[PDB]
Curated annotation (Swiss-Prot):
Region described as Interaction with PLN: 788-808, 932-943
Family: Belongs to the cation transport ATPase (P-type) (TC 3.A.3) family. Type IIA subfamily.
Domain of life of the source: Eukaryota
Protein name: Sarcoplasmic/endoplasmic reticulum calcium ATPase 1
Means of activity regulation: Inhibited by sarcolipin (SLN) and myoregulin (MRLN). Has also been shown to be reversibly inhibited by phospholamban (PLN) at low calcium concentrations in vitro. Dephosphorylated PLN decreases the apparent affinity of the ATPase for calcium and this inhibition is regulated by the phosphorylation of PLN in vitro. Enhanced by DWORF; DWORF increases activity by displacing sarcolipin (SLN), phospholamban (PLN) and myoregulin (MRLN).
Outcome, altering residue 309 to A: Interferes with conformation changes that are essential for ATP-dependent Ca(2+) transport
Residues that bear Phosphothreonine: 441, 569
Membrane-crossing residue ranges in chain numbering: 49-69, 90-110, 254-273, 296-313, 758-777, 788-808, 829-851, 898-917, 931-949, 965-985
Entry keyword Ribonucleoprotein: no
Amino acid sequence: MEAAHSKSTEECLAYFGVSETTGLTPDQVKRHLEKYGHNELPAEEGKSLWELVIEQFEDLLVRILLLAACISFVLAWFEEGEETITAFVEPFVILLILIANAIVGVWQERNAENAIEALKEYEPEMGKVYRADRKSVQRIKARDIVPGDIVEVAVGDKVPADIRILSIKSTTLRVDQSILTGESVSVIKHTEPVPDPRAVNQDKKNMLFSGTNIAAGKALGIVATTGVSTEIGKIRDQMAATEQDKTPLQQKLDEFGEQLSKVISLICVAVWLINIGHFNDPVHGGSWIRGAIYYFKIAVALAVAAIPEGLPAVITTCLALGTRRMAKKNAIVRSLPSVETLGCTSVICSDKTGTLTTNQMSVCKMFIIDKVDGDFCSLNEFSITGSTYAPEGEVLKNDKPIRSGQFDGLVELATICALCNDSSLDFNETKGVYEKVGEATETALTTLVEKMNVFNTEVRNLSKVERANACNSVIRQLMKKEFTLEFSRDRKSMSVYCSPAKSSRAAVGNKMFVKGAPEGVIDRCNYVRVGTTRVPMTGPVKEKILSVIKEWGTGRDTLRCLALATRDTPPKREEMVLDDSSRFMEYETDLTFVGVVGMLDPPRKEVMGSIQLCRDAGIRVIMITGDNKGTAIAICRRIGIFGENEEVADRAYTGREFDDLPLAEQREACRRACCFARVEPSHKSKIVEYLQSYDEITAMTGDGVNDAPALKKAEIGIAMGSGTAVAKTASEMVLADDNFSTIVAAVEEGRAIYNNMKQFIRYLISSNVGEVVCIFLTAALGLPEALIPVQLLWVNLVTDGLPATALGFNPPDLDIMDRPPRSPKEPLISGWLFFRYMAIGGYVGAATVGAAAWWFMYAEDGPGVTYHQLTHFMQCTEDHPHFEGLDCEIFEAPEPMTMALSVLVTIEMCNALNSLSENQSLMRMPPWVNIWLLGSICLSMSLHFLILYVDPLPMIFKLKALDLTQWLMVLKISLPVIGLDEILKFIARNYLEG
Ligand SMILES: CC(=O)C1=C(O)N2[C@@H](C1=O)[C@@H]1c3c[nH]c4cccc(c34)C[C@@H]1C2(C)C
């Protein structure tokens, strides 16, 4: 029964055929349990640690490398030699890296409390019911409550299901609906039905929502829905249906592996095809084995060289470091991958109150009727000073200070504000400041009467804490607050019934003090106050009052206005039913207009800036506020979302105007709008969806479970540090200070990160191209292998690892925020960066192969064979090119490889400095610009020596220390890369800018 709010208390009792006195019976209990299930949210079956890992080897590249480790194992076994001491390191290390990397990949789900699960924090363990099998209340497992039974809730309880209230035992029932919205202000319930069948939870004043708490009272209700059929459960389901897309980066990388996975394979085919000539070799000669083992060897090396094995660890470290860096700027990023996608942010929809504003309400303008006479009319406008809740400030007219007391209408105005209130001030000891106690809109009002002091009450005597509620406590004397009819969006006003304090048997004198939104209040006024006199509200004076309000709310002041009225001859206490808020407006009629107060919820001192920072960065900012369309547009201009005079006839909508437009125009409106006023519960989600259809990475703020869905959808769901728990667990980033500017700071910081990530990505992949050229060369020229996988790995993992990480601290661009949002379609390394990074590789290739062939031919300690065709043969089945030669095992000597490796390691340290900037010379951008980079380079080179001397390593890696002469040959064929890139860089700065 999900429309219980609109049905009568009797109707609900009938629907389920249950008695309010005994409740369901054990036969009804079982029958109900079998039809609706148990009252709880469905448990989660998290992915299996093995399932996750398995899915990581579901990747194409991880396979191509896996297979290799397999090709490596077969070879590692089908081999005969004394190098057996390290004949399995290769297929071992390969497989290992594959493990360590998969884990790192899976380290994106271990710890990440999600909303769909955090929602159990709100369902309680026990509930209280009245069942036919007893007279007293029994407290059963909430898990076992079903629709239709009778429950009981009292102050302190967490409502165990969606319950329709049957009767209120206490004087008034108060509920804390915070887990849904965020607002602590408890709400008042009633048992009277709510007509509208499609009423929103906020108007279902007769329902108690599962997961909420009883602030004050005791009540009895009939359970309407349970499990995933409640409000929270319905939200919990939306969550579960929300698909989560891969970050524009992941998508780009995942596609790179496809691109890479194809080439790798294509090259293993061009290799074979090149050695097809072997088809013309005597069967009775050579070897059908040395060929298969050779084609298989250079294939494995080929894969190992093409894949940047260190990338995963580098990206994961950069993002970890990147997270801590945001935290320093009060941006808690929960998802690592988010530190990346944050920079692609193209749209930011931010709530106003508290994010774009301080949420520190303050009254700074008010007016009463000065006089009415014929068509002539005059008001009495004022101004107040002090924006803090402190009772420190003053009232003044025409910038000149006046004493409020000297105005009667100001006394009344003051009386209402203090009587038709519900909050109060409180001076803090530690903080040493006055803290608001209750609604911010009210406290401001409380703070007002303390500044006005219409009764000249001597307060300068009183201490801080004493004068806090001084002037208020005084007004609370002149009248007795009988009862108060709560505020309801229905009539958007509220009132309190009062009677004079000094009065024994006086049956005349009671007054009702109304406070609410101007339109409603003012139309229920037949009289207008003028001092202490009163005269009929005439058409003119009405337009006068309304116009001053339009001004204060639509002008540069952007003030929230409250009209204040009083019912002079209120209905008799007896004739009022204080149980049907549907009658409250009626009670609040034939009113007299007393005054108007205008308060301000001031924009954060850093929003205008951050908004400008956004116009530059080409980032659209969409505000979502509670204000009306009029004040909303007005606030938008005030902070810059709109230009003072720019037309916004189609760039600002109110939830209502939005629902009127057809599903097509709504999509069109989401691409142009910048201001949403009075939005519906399901709008933020629709907004996010219509924005995503335009391929825009969206940031969406908001909290409480009503917002959870939207946040889950948006690419960057933002919660407040002071927000609900579920809001946070559903968001990608938390604002440790609730400040809009923190958002912007994070986008910039994400922009840095992506650029540096794009820097080291090219760094590494280029290193891979040089290696692939190196292998393919030593293969197309039948030369002996220059570099082997075990070496390449230590390179692409460590040597190249640290510097790539170092690049993480590369200084950001100064115009980092003065260029549009990176389209999630823009590729990584392409175009100029292809040719540019192709040549670097091709050089790196030739340079390594050359360094090998050199030692082999033009080296002293090396068996010179200049033009001896290392290509023409390696077979050595003739021994002709070395008649009196009894040694051919030098074609696998460690020296030449140690030459090839040293070249690569040196060239990469170089390119690491060439990588400080994409197109800037090291002249303008010295090496020491990035200290961490210089550090890693040393840590690497030295580590290069570690594997050349420490006995185990040098042999295991198949390397031998180099002579001070040979090393002189490395620098000779390494250092030059720095000039080559400077050239390509030069070619970009000058002949590539237009
Ligand atoms: C551009 C591109 O598609 C990719 C890549 O380029 N990479 C990863 C990848 O998916 C591969 C990968 C994922 N998980 C591991 C664990 C161990 C080793 C590897 C991987 C190799 C692949 C890597 C890191 C090069």
